[model samples]
Target: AKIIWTRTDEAPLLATYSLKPVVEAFAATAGIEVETRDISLAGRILAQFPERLTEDQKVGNALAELGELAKTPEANIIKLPNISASVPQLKAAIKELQDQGYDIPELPDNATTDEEKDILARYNAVKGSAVNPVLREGNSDRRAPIAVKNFVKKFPHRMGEWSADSKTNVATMDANDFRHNEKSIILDAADEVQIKHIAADGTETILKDSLKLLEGEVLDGTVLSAKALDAFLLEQVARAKAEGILFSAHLKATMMKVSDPIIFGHVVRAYFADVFAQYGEQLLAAGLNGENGLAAILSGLESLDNGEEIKAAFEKGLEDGPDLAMVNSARGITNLHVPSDVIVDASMPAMIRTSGHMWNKDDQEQDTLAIIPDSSYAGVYQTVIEDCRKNGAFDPTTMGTVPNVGLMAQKAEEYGSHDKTFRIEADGVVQVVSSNGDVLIEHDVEANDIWRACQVKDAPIQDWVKLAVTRSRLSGMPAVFWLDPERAHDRNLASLVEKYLADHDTEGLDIQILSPVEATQLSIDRIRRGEDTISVTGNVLRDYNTDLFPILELGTSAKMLSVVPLMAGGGLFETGAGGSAPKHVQQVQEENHLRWDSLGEFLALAESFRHELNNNGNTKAGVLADALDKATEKLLNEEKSPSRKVGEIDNRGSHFWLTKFWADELAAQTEDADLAATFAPVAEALNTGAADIDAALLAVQGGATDLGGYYSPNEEKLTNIMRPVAQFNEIVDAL
Candidate 1:
């Protein structure tokens, strides 16, 4: 007979306390003594072994004790055990065996043990799993182990065999290595959460040592009111005693379940939808405007709650997927700072189509690269490199020549398992995974701290300022791009920015520029050059829309980028998958961007600008002039005055009628006239600019989600001391 353990409200708080109740619930039996067994993790088991014996030896010994068959065998065996055959060959063998009235051993017809019952019951519950079972190893998913007699009817074979219960199966499976393979493990047992209460024996006189506050009590000859006594918390007992209170209290609010790990998972999952939203529609829109799509995450995150909802929200976002397409925007905007190439036009013959790389927790990546009739890999690579070079990031003499932008190579001797070459190009907007997944890049040419820059044809590569421009435009906000200090030259960066903005027709976007080197005074070369350094710089640019849109740039050594998207604004995994789940919608929205035609145009323009400036005989000066002029007009405009006359009467408004109403209201109440005067200007502005403001706000709202995450613009300071002034040629459009 198998028994199934089901949780209910009436269960006793402690396992010891519950034994009686459990036995009583089935209380027809009389003289039975029952004992409970506790099960621990494999790590605990290994830790308990004597140091003299290797852990494997102890584990093997434990298995030997379970059954005689578990001992090592001396003779070689030729016959296959129990049930075995190839998929195609097996079906034929099984049918033939069945037809011959021979029982073909298979997975049990139904669970006949306690372990099976527990496994069947909890199959639908939340559990962790390995990233990829086929490649990474065994499934991390687990449930409570149960004995055969108590197994459920659904899955017959031992649902969970005891670690010590050796059988033929033990020979085929490796020892449990939960610590190495499973990042998180959950224990499912009825008695997991137990509460104990102190006994109420009034005669014990425990109060002498531990003071208890009484209502309307006086302690040490000082009177204390009930309200005052309530404030005598244990954490503040010192002050309470100083104030002559003998009792200590506890605020149950702080003792609530919000901080519980389980609760944390739930809440995070709940908020994950909003976080995923940041990566979907909102992030994409933000990218279009050239803002750091990352800012979209902050909006949803700012309002997150604690406990279950937050945890659930966080988990939910990852499992589902954030809008990953937003990553391309970041990549595109990031300043690579390398040598130049002719950016391939979508309509050209050499256009080797390329699409933005995307990735996630499930190991998902886009299958097809973006293609246009004339896409040129070399051309595309060259333009990006040239742009990077101009930004002072790529210096061939220093960093050495690369295969292309996004492509990397090492000396033959230095090439680790990878093809003597590697690609700096992202698998997606860099994913944050365990530390092991990170790929490192460095120039081993010299032992000195002086690191080389990325380059092609002896020049530096440019960063993706264009993406920043796009995000800025989409968000209708000003954005800042970080230039690495060791490499970023203001003049070079300015030139690159001018080129990208000019080519994209982004004359209207606002941009602020600074280098990480300048801000932090750290050498990018040193960080990359040091074998010990794991992460480079993260702080880059910021965009201001209604809020701050910070664009953080991570160095080659950056790790676990996925954690940010996964943890932001209620991650999805912690939360259950249900309505408006984070990843799926994010997934769908990312797919939608694949059909976009503008991406190719943007690439082409970036190339044209590069070609015009870097290529021999190109009109570099003219291109620079045009780019700066366009950028100036788009980024900083002369504030023009409204054509309103102070003393003129308006025919359109029926001002006389409104004046009469205002006067009547004032006569009726003293405050009405004052209120009218106070609100009139506000009302006028709102009524007049309402559509425009709403539109701008709508644009801001639009770029909140993408494949990467949510992005929002930063808020600007309007309270500066400078007095407002009319436009003039001299200072009209200073950026």
Candidate 2:
């Protein structure tokens, strides 16, 4: 696993324990089956791809010539020295063509060398990687490996190779896969002072201070005496104040060790609990981000419980009906699947035990599936349950207020303490069970091949697993292996939460205590449960509401359930919030207003030039070219470079470039006598247009972007969607 956070100085006691040989030894064993990886900021992985694109001109030209050499058995010679085709692939291609109703030439068993036929029957056969090139060079043996060697030498670094996605092209190659790959994990780590003092200098100076510790005090060199460690942290903070980059320096002083399960789990709980409360805050913030403000809210109200009553009460009786403009777009249901609910409200102790993130290959295609709640929260749940049953009042802020603690005090709670009963060691890493047996505190788990988690060489895996466990326990759910192609991961998580709540019920505290979506969901669950629920009369509770409800509207609208991130034209990607407009609405505006006026005018002129190319030859071509050059020059002269301006113009000049710009261009000037003679400029131009679109797309490293210059609400205009519309239009027009 890759360790992303290496600096920390607050917990020297815990830091020393990580350095203990005993703890490191135990962790080595536990990390075998489970793997951990750290996550990079979004879009960081895209850096794995090359900055420059491959030059496909040669490949394009080769395919063009191949088209001229038709597969008609009698028409062409397959006799070049290196000519060789795999029988299986040849048969497969031939069969495909025949299945598509195209005539196929029979392959003769003894046919070899050159075969001559009418020169007219020329173009056929598709170029594929399976086809071997026939060398026409002199002094070469047909069976020699020299040709393969030559091919290898030509691609010195194996550059221009494709990775999983076509978009991620490799510009360079490395011999060892590790050099090009990465692994990561978020783990409890020793503070910087301890790390530098121990890891760098190999000194165990902190060990002397904890010599008088009890059995639990000196755990694998971690858990420094609280008083001593706190003092050390303060000293370090003061020292850091004297140095430059004080923010980073002081941050190091306060950094908590995630490598320890106890500490790590605690961190996880706090991180997510804080994140949970902020979701509602975010929604409210979004609502208030406009000038119209909260007053813009739809205020006409009836009983929110009765849709029909609300609709009827709000309906207008105008003869001509109200203007559509006054109304917000239809309230389509938007579903935003947030899997975060399961990660919230766990304790820091639980976080130390279960908050490590990982990339499971099974679920990587989608996103991580969270099932369990944090261990501390698990303790809280057990506490709440006991309290609810006993009619005991509870406060979540203190462990004393928790009902579980009171019950445990009466009956010796089994899983309520931090002390552990077990120990693990594998591959020289160690992990100890907590004193109360509620969490596992790991000493050291070295980073290995797990991607993204092991940014450095020595990330702790035991702490990582503990954190993962913490996240699971907080939700009172098990981890899900969710990797479906059709559903977005966020939505899948929402559905998973819904499904889990349906199967399980928690009394006293409704699940809706989480969010509005969660609240509404509980209602749905109650309905489903009621329908299937048995009545005291020995009869099933029939779904009577089915008669009143429209079957089409039985469930929440699919669109309303999840807010998907939309990737629009010009390659611009945006997340349409629950209140955001639909892509189609934006698209309509774009199609109506073509923003690339100059480019559009150039296309029209190019088409006219193509017409002139056929009818007037060099004369019209020269005149048009001169006029185009002048226009291009003027645009260029006003800037720093005219060549780039002309390049852009030339790139968009294909009415023929539309179909397969690169291919058409090659085919137009292909060496094949007959195909070259058959070259049609107009066809090429169309293909060029298509190719240009693709090229324009390449200029966008991360797809399209929303450009500047938007129309704002002016004194004269109440509402103007023109700027956003035009901006999106430019993107589409380029495509």
Candidate 3:
């Protein structure tokens, strides 16, 4: 059996460098091979521009390869969190690659030439939530372990108090939005669909060509009027100011790559209306599009003729507009600094947890008018806020868990809509026309309107339903499917749920389908009463709720166990839902200390091993898996997880401790006495040399590290820096 581990970005990548060797050595004893697939931002970038790079500089497009493997029974991937690069993150990775002599073309905001346009298109393939959609040929199954829940109960985190009179609320577009302008169809037969923009003058422009569709697939199309968005953004700027609340925008720009950035830019232009009103043409002409975030424009301002004047207007706009929320108050990093910084999934839960507040520029907790432009899942947050205001904070000891069973197999819903999404070029009718000359779904739209379509095949839908039923049976918990009947897409999906759900024997099972808003209310009530509930939802909501509930309950989503059972007899176990990876990498570079806790990875690995044992009949993997699980338990009980402070037990030291426990567990196990005999000497040696190993791990800290480049670190330098303890390395290598 083999485990295909993902080589992702930043902190996770660095941690893999330190721990991959230990895993490989351990797995080797059980006749299990471990290999890595590079899905890192830099790796993806290099793969896309293969013709432009030197042979050695380019790598295989592992992401695309993984997608194919995901459809096979042999696939068993240990997935890690990667950067869903925003334009800012995308550009930074590109610059780092360029510095390393990878001759990748630049991603300019305004592409005038065909070459530049082609370059932009290629890079766009590597950006945003590119990797997940490709390899997730399975639905998501996320749960919080009893051990994790116990840890939180034992050491409860700080929860801010919510006030009923607090002037905080969620603001969203009431009309002319995605939710308001959605249309759907349950395809009865196979068809070739093409998206076309029909101008008022009857000029036809193909937006997407011949998208092949399957029978019984749910097809959906929606539109968001850019003009209506512009109107609401301006209205909300006044709403936030008059309400005396901090103004903050929560969006998944990194995931919803195309649409959210455009929406984010609309928010930016509205907030700095005066600034843009004065210099909109010049700033935009100079490639300082607001979609790239304020920092992108502000940094590029130094070269412009009226750069100083334009910057001064921005300073004044801060006062003129509502108080902007702060990401880093001391460093003057506002929420608007980057499109990916404050995502709705992470940010909204955080705000709710922190007393319906976000930090103001003064570093003080204050009520914030959270702006979630789309109304689709906006009501979920709003309902939660209303509950929080009335009931105060949820008690960690008393609150019930809300684990998610997500329907995201084979790129279902809006997450799979990127290729089909378009910013309308002209005032026209954007339509999804079938090969049979039927307009399946269409919308009257204007220029710059956000138009997109999504599809879910009958197979994935059936599988999703089966998974939800199985989860209900296993947990004996009430499973609620959050599908809004009011929304076209969900209505179509809701009917499919009805059709497929009948295939299973659901006797004595508690199951219900409710709208997101209503479902949130029920979840809040049940969870408040200390009853666990299952949230079975679509792709986007799955992404949102997985983070939202876990963070609220556990303080961090790192401990959540996510397993994706591939439709094709395989497993895709995922690590932490946390995103502070870049900051962890920043700390490691600055102080040579990694504060990242690899608890999620440790948990994921045990599951992957179990998967191999069950699927391939590898009993040795079972023995290894049991010991690893016990070792993890010891790691938690022994308090060997990574510490936050420098000169303490950081990620490296934590890994050493886990390795020690793993060795000790292997030595003590009776099921595999021969395996135990093989590891006994290793365990004893580690116990004897533990102090020396700790000292060695500590000696290299409190300094800077260089790995040749940021995005693509030089392998040799990376390996040496990560594996600093020669004594421990030798022991593992000897095995």
Stretches off by above 4 angstroms in model 1 are 1-463, 484-494, 517-735
Backbone collision tally, model 3: 0
Candidate 3, residues 106-183, lDDT tens digits: the string is 897898899889988998888877877777778989988666787777778888988989888999989999998988
Lowest lDDT sum, 10 consecutive residues, model 2, at 533-542
* Model 2 spans > 4 angstroms off: 1-240, 246-664, 671-735
Q: Candidate 2 at 439: error in angstroms?
A: 21
Which digits, one per residue and each the tens of the lDDT, describe model 1 over residues 316-355?
5443432221123433321011101111121111111111
Better of 2 and 3 by TM-score: 3
lDDT: which candidate is best?
3
RMSD after CA superposition, every candidate: 36.7, 33.1, 5.7
What's the lDDT for all of these models?
0.22, 0.21, 0.89
- lDDT by residue for model 2 (677-700), tens: 333442343344544543543232
Give candidate 3 misplaced runs (Cα > 4 Å): 5-68, 80-134, 226-231, 268-321, 327-341, 425-428, 505-508, 576-596, 613-627, 643-653, 660-735
Q: Which structure is stronger by lDDT: 2 or 3?
A: 3
Ranking by TM-score: 3, 2, 1
Query: Which candidate wins on TM-score?
Result: 3
| True lDDT of residue 472, candidate 1 | 49
